[PDB]
Design an enzyme around this catalytic site. Sequence first.
Site, short mmCIF file in Angstrom:
data_model
loop_
_atom_site.label_atom_id
_atom_site.label_comp_id
_atom_site.label_asym_id
_atom_site.label_seq_id
_atom_site.Cartn_x
_atom_site.Cartn_y
_atom_site.Cartn_z
N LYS A 104 62.09 31.65 33.60
CA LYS A 104 62.08 30.21 33.87
C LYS A 104 61.80 29.36 32.62
O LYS A 104 62.30 28.26 32.45
CB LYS A 104 61.02 29.89 34.92
N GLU B 39 59.26 19.62 41.43
CA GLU B 39 58.62 19.86 42.70
C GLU B 39 58.60 21.38 42.72
O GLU B 39 59.40 22.04 42.05
CB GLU B 39 59.41 19.29 43.90
N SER C 244 63.34 39.88 35.34
CA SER C 244 63.09 38.45 35.24
C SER C 244 61.65 38.00 35.00
O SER C 244 61.43 36.96 34.37
CB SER C 244 63.68 37.74 36.47
C1 LIG Z 1 61.81 31.94 39.97
C2 LIG Z 1 62.03 33.49 39.76
C3 LIG Z 1 63.21 34.11 40.17
C4 LIG Z 1 64.21 33.39 41.15
O1 LIG Z 1 65.02 32.31 40.67
P1 LIG Z 1 66.42 32.47 40.04
O2 LIG Z 1 66.75 31.08 39.80
O3 LIG Z 1 67.32 33.05 41.06
O4 LIG Z 1 66.31 33.25 38.83
C5 LIG Z 1 63.44 35.40 39.81
N1 LIG Z 1 62.53 36.11 39.07
C6 LIG Z 1 61.36 35.53 38.69
C7 LIG Z 1 60.35 36.34 37.99
C8 LIG Z 1 61.10 34.21 39.03
O5 LIG Z 1 59.93 33.64 38.67
#
Ligand SMILES: *Cc1c(COP(=O)(O)O)cnc(C)c1O
Lengths: 255, 255, 394, 394
Positions: C86, C108, C376
């Site tokens: 993010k 938000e 992620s």
């Molecule tokens: C916010 C989040 C996601 C989900 O959002 P995407 O927009 O689909 O990437 C995925 N992995 C992590 C670790 C997140 O914090």
Amino acid sequence: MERYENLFAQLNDRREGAFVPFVTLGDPGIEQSLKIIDTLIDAGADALELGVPFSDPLADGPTIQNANLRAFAAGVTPAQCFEMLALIREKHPTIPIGLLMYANLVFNNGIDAFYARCEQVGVDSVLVADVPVEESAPFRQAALRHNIAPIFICPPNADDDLLRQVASYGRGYTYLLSRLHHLIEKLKEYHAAPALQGFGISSPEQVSAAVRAGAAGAISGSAIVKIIEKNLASPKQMLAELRSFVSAMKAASRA
Amino acid sequence: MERYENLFAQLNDRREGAFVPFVTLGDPGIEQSLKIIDTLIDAGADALELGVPFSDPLADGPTIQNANLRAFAAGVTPAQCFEMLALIREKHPTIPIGLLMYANLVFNNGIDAFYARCEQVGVDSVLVADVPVEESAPFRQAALRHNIAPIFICPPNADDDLLRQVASYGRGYTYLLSRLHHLIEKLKEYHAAPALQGFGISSPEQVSAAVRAGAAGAISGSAIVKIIEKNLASPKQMLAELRSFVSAMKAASRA
Amino acid sequence: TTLLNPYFGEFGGMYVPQILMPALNQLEEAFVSAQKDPEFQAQFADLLKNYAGRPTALTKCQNITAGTRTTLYLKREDLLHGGAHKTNQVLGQALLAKRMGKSEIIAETGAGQHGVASALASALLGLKCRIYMGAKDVERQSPNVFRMRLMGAEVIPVHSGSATLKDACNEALRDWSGSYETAHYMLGTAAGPHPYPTIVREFQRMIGEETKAQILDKEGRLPDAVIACVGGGSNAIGMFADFINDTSVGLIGVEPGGHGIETGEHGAPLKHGRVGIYFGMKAPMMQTADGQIEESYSISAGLDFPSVGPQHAYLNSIGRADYVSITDDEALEAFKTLCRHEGIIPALESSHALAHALKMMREQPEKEQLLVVNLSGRGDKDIFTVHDILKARG
Amino acid sequence: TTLLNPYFGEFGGMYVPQILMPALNQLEEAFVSAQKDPEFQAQFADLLKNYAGRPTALTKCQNITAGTRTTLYLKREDLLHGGAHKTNQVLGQALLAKRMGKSEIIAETGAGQHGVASALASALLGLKCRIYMGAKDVERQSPNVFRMRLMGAEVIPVHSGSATLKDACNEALRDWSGSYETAHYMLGTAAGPHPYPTIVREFQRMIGEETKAQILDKEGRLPDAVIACVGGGSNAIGMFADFINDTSVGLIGVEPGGHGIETGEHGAPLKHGRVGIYFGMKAPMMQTADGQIEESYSISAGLDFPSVGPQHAYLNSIGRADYVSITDDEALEAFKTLCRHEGIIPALESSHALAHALKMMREQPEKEQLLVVNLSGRGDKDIFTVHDILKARG
Ligand SMILES: *Cc1c(COP(=O)(O)O)cnc(C)c1O
Ligand SMILES: O=P(O)(O)OC[C@@H](O)[C@@H](O)c1c[nH]c2ccccc12
Ligand SMILES: O=P(O)(O)OC[C@@H](O)[C@@H](O)c1c[nH]c2ccccc12
Ligand SMILES: *Cc1c(COP(=O)(O)O)cnc(C)c1O
């Protein structure tokens, strides 16, 4: 040193091994500890190995660690231990008295001053558990200047170099860690101080085996301390049980 | 469309402005909502602007959001709203009825089918709140094929291009966001549908000011809904208060 | 009129009230301008590298694939400052806000993760950040709320409507409708109205570009497939973008299956929802038969979203990317497996992608395949969730 | 006899029971051998880079120094996998264990941070890790205990003695005394008996080497001073080592002042304790007048240690490095300042170093000075501690 030399000459003249109890000074209280020590002597201890409670005894086993805690709960300090030592020597003029120390309590107010105090109260030897031969120079020198035997542990993983150093630097007795016929033979070959086997000695047959292996005697600590541990509520029973155990272990050492 | 054209010709012949209440269908219940609507009409509403509760009304203000929740608590669905619409037209044959929709409820079962259903029940216009002129093609085309006026919002930040599109694509009325003399003049220059000012109209003086500014009328939603909100426990008092407020706002529109 | 196409096939668009169109048009133009500006790029690159920690590692995980012909690499977005991908795009959006002369950020958040990301970029770049949050979420999110306030963001509890995320989004957009000259709405995923799906993708595409250079360096070829979890779609489109024209490379998006697709409690609209219009876009969504937006569900809050970005709907429709789902239980097993075998605690969101790679591997153990999973985020944040579930399962 | 000098002036040595000397000698020899082995170095480098995320960023913090002539950079060990610098050296020690043919790791931990680090390296490198922990600590450390077990480490609750850390260390060494042929004792700081102070330093020195290259790249000169918090001394010696022969560069170590030196509740033995012998080394320690080791204290568990590494005692004695203390309150203010102005949540340990740099800056705002603070770790772990304190202070 003289007391150990005298004790081992006498025992040898009797084809006898030494039985040496270990207890923590002050456990479970000063008075009870002095009574415990007098009972071990009356019951037959040839010498004593005494611990001075330390806050961070990295080498003390579980049973011993609990003895330190009981002594600390009674408020035992090194100064009170030295007062107890003086009184014990004042009552028993010939029994060798050895201390089991941790380096910081010996180094704290000056290494030389510590061995001077041992000499003053009548202590005969000092084993500093966390000082290997490699770091022993100041301790063994201070001990010799004050006629205190510096005691070294000969562990199971000892090599020839260690045996020679231990034989050369030690006096009084050599502390032979049971966890041996060979270690014992080399120690004698190198003219080491008489060996006392220590670690897990809790039965009469182990004392006879140690003497038969060539050791000059055996040390028993956890087995003695557990007796204290189990009878904290019956001081009388504690001494009676201690007398019986020591008397049995000592008989095992006789020819 | 015909009903709006007829209403604005009559009002104009009377040098009068239109007063158009907005309420959420089903708030606070189906029966009470139908009674609320009949009271607004009897009290003087020239037209109605009706909301169909949607789960994610991104543009509804706090008061309206609470009206949606009350309607959902009563279990109101779009199908029940269309049944209510049919009954309202069946009782009032000439009052223009406009819907305030969110795109998904119009798109859900097919855009054309939605405007066909509006025509079937007698609805006259539809404003899809989240469809800007740029995305309006399918909606306005479907509306015209079913004789429903497509309504567009002319916001405060509108440029000349937006004014021209709104004038060209809209029918029935132009929804003039109060948050204007200039916006109103250009809309007339471009022959836009008569303008009704909306947003924060809650007092009679705002209705007279809107008409004086050149608007053909004014829409009032939150002020009406708050009356519902405050009298949920006294249905009778709710209608009485609604009659008084609408009657006052409508008088403000007269020459 | 727009500078860029607002649609990906039939998906996307700008379904917002008329009053917000000038804000969207302004944003699209600033973004097009920024993309051609070497200075903007140098500044965004400097922040990514010296503040966020890019490039992130591409870690080969040998223990987990032992005994199979699968070679697995994890793109380490969990090592990025903030602990998740993010961070990449909020830094880019905060720079766009400044480019437009704005000094305020509106966001938000539900779970609070986007909130934290927005707040940290705002703290760093001197922006007054205000985050709308449903009162129900504020109560259930103490840690992240505290993080946001520690970083200086004003966290605004919303009690209007049902006091949930939709209510916070509503208030956020209303705010933005009146303050857009001085405030930028920082959207947290590759969804919503154009230009956001495009901007977010472009501001996350370094994930895929780095992965390409790293895999070519280490393996000398491209992956057989890159796999990424899909909530709104930002980390997955960020991983996928640079490989879209490399047709030999599979793109697999993983939506949350929650308690199982058949139970209806999931967050897999792309494959199990229906096209609709909401949140400013035309896209697959979870909805009732009469068009209300359904509630989604996943053990992972970050994947608990009822729709999906339009570019994903599009890539799916033309068959360029394939989307699957992974249940809570499969995600939990992948979570435990990575901790134990690689000493990496992954986010539960990311565990869905890993779970799917583990299935591709385990189902066909003799299939030779080079896979890259986008890790992620890190999962320190999920320790209590996992703990309690496991404790509950004795 | 040893291959390397066991002492730094009068400090250091090998004060362990005779039975452990062969284990220490074996370790020293394996380490000397490993340092001359390009393969070992390549393997350690590969893990540092591709698994841990090195090199870590050197972040310039402009907001925090605005209005002063101080330029501050933060060496980002908080971005290292695991969230702290500890990871660097446990990976090196785990490789040494394998070099010695060992497949088991013995560690002990109080706060649980060393435990987590040991467990993750062990998980990664296929080592059976057993961590001794005082029963009192296990109870007060649920999160880290769970992390350790998630990563496959066996967490052994110790009830012997007082059931605290000293009891866990005791049991750990006893274990090691009997199992050293197959188990390696992974010490977690630059203290204890030789060769550990030397090994830990060498396995953390990349912090300082990278900092040097990064600062020369960005500023074209060396720092006027590098600043680091000091518990046992590993992150600080890691930062300091490569600069020791650059005599123009100040080395400032920051010990925890707790509630204030005068209250006796602190962890600043180097400047306020007395030389003693414990934990296998001769070093400054907090001790009673008759030689018992005192209890230390800091709001930060990672700095709550009653002694300090010997090389620090030595650098201090010859005046090459200066050591100071920072109280809980000063550390808390530095923590809040960094979150708000840079969007980085630092570990409370690291906040002590930052607090001291903030004081050097604020006390002489017109003094031109280039400072580098070692941000040893991230502070997500400290959020509840800080929260409750602040809540308690209304
Ligand atoms: C916010 C989040 C996601 C989900 O959002 P995407 O927009 O689909 O990437 C995925 N992995 C992590 C670790 C997140 O914090
Ligand atoms: O308790 P045991 O197994 O009988 O062994 C005596 C031993 O504990 C005692 O001599 C001792 C107490 N503390 C020590 C420290 C190091 C070496 C030996 C000791
Ligand atoms: O409530 P007000 O301030 O009187 O304004 C009417 C408005 O709320 C109503 O027409 C309306 C309800 N929902 C909307 C959505 C978009 C535009 C307008 C509306
Ligand atoms: C463990 C820890 C420290 C303290 O140990 P040192 O050996 O003195 O470095 C400092 N910072 C962090 C973040 C830690 O986890």
